[PDB]
């Protein structure tokens, strides 16, 4: 790859510079090059990888939604341009999701390693299948939704066995799974019961908050609350 000749440590350094510069495509490329060195990522490096790719696909998702809304409104009561450009953005978005999922499958998702990394990467697999499912149609789409659900479920099982109920990866995973249930799977009740179970169980064991981590935990707990307020 284009990062093949750069040292891993230099790639990490440059991803951090790219984050400070708000250069998230560069950031993602640096982190892909770092993953391709074939060594595990630390918690901090997982954050770099996550932030970079989420920023990239987030801008694509937002663009896609704008164009899709224009497209649907031009299909109620003339030329091909809106559809074409929406397809162009859609294709790039799928390309970024394919890249992330390929990294997860080729390099990151392993049998061993700690529960944090195993849960995080399976959560990430669920997320990027979910983003593919937001734009999918037909025979492609059914297999995508099953893929997202199975990744999320495997992460859920590990998280419930191996992490405290306030752990921010466990909470973030449950938050994102509930979003999948509501927005993708058309299962509002499953989404609501998962969000409420997650919030309540975090509150019941609030003493398990970690001092290097509790701000993230309580942030997700509030986001579960906002979704429950939205959904009820």
């Amino acid at each position: 790859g284009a990062m093949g000749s750069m040292e891993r440590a230099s790639l990490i350094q440059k991803a951090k510079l790219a984050e400070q510069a708000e250069r998230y495509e560069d950031m993602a490329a640096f982190m892909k090059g770092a993953v391709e060195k074939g060594e595990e990522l630390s918690c901090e490096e997982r954050n770099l990888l996550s932030v970079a790719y989420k920023n990239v696909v987030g801008g694509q998702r937002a663009a896609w939604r704008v164009l899709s809304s224009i497209e649907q409104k031009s299909n109620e009561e003339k030329g091909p341009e809106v559809r074409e450009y929406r397809e162009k953005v859609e294709t790039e978005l799928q390309g970024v999701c394919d890249t992330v999922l390929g990294l997860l499958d080729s390099h990151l998702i392993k049998e061993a390693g700690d529960a944090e990394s195993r849960v995080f990467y399976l959560k990430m697999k669920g997320d990027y299948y979910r983003y593919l499912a937001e734009v999918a149609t037909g025979d492609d789409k059914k297999r995508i939704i099953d893929s997202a659900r199975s990744a999320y479920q495997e992460a859920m099982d590990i998280s419930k066995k191996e992490m405290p109920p306030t752990n921010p990866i466990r909470l973030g995973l449950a938050l994102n799974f509930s979003v999948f249930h509501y927005e993708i799977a058309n299962s509002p009740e499953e989404a609501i019961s998962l969000a409420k179970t997650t919030f309540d169980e975090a509150m019941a064991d609030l003493h398990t908050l970690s001092e290097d981590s509790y701000k993230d935990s309580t942030l997700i707990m509030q986001l579960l609350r906002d979704n429950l307020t939205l959904w009820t």
């Binding site: 770099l48 509930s178 979003v179 927005e183």
Partner: peptide
């Protein structure tokens, strides 16, 4: 208004 997912934090 769409559901909120896990945000970026660094």
């Amino acid at each position: 208004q769409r559901s909120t997912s896990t945000p970026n934090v660094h």
